[PDB]
């Protein structure tokens, strides 16, 4: 089932990447993507979001993470957190790395995202392999 696969892959990604905080984001409605939810996370929540604010955040499709994912590439940044469900800056985050996942109907359905509150993170070529594998598996689950 999708939910068990999402939780398993998020655990693998979080442990492999050594990230401080990792999340699975999911878009709604299908094929329209006006809202995004954090459906699962590992590690410590950023101070700018809360357990009660994980759902129903509006998607700004003009954020370049959205366009980079639809161009077939992973996304990373030190300051731009498109789907993190707060309008506040979050300077405690020093790095994010995300990859899109596409459902069985080949539609952009969400992201798998890793965050660092510290400056050191493993290299992008390793993060790419970790994310790509998880996104392949999650994209087969629903």
């Amino acid at each position: 089932r999708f939910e068990s696969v999402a939780l398993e892959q998020l655990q693998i990604v979080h442990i492999s990447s050594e990230a401080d905080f990792s999340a699975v984001y999911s878009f709604r409605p299908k094929n329209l993507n006006y809202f995004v939810d954090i459906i699962a996370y590992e590690g410590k929540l950023p101070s700018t979001i809360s357990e009660k604010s994980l759902g129903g955040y509006p998607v700004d499709k003009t954020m370049d993470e959205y366009t980079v994912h639809l161009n077939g590439r992973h996304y990373y940044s030190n300051s731009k957190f498109a789907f993190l469900p707060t309008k506040k800056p979050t300077p405690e985050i020093n790095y994010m790395y995300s990859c899109p996942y596409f459902n069985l109907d080949n539609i952009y359905a969400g992201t798998i995202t890793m965050y660092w509150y510290r400056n050191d993170h493993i290299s992008n070529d390793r993060l790419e392999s970790i994310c790509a594998q998880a996104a392949r598996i999650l994209g087969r689950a629903k």
């Binding site: 709604r28 409605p29 094929n31 329209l32 006006y34 809202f35 939810d37 604010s53 759902g55 129903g56 955040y57 509006p58 469900p85 309008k87």
Partner: protein, 72 residues
């Protein structure tokens, strides 16, 4: 996206002028908002940028007022 461009302009206007100000955002608040906006549009589709932006904002605002949705 293969989306109806008038609906998209209408919805984005409601999101950007009203929904973004909802104090309590949730799966349920987003689902209820889209349900209202979807049928409002389909009953009488807007057909220009100006009409879609104006009507999307006005209809979302009426929805928030009438449903007593707490804003920011």
């Amino acid at each position: 996206m293969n989306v109806d461009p008038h609906f998209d302009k209408f919805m984005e206007s409601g999101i950007r002028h009203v929904y973004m100000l909802f104090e309590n955002k949730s799966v349920e608040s987003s689902e209820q908002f889209y349900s209202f906006m979807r049928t409002t549009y389909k009953n009488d589709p807007c057909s220009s940028d100006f009409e879609c932006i104006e009507r999307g904002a006005e209809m979302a605002q009426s929805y928030a007022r009438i449903m007593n949705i707490k804003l920011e």
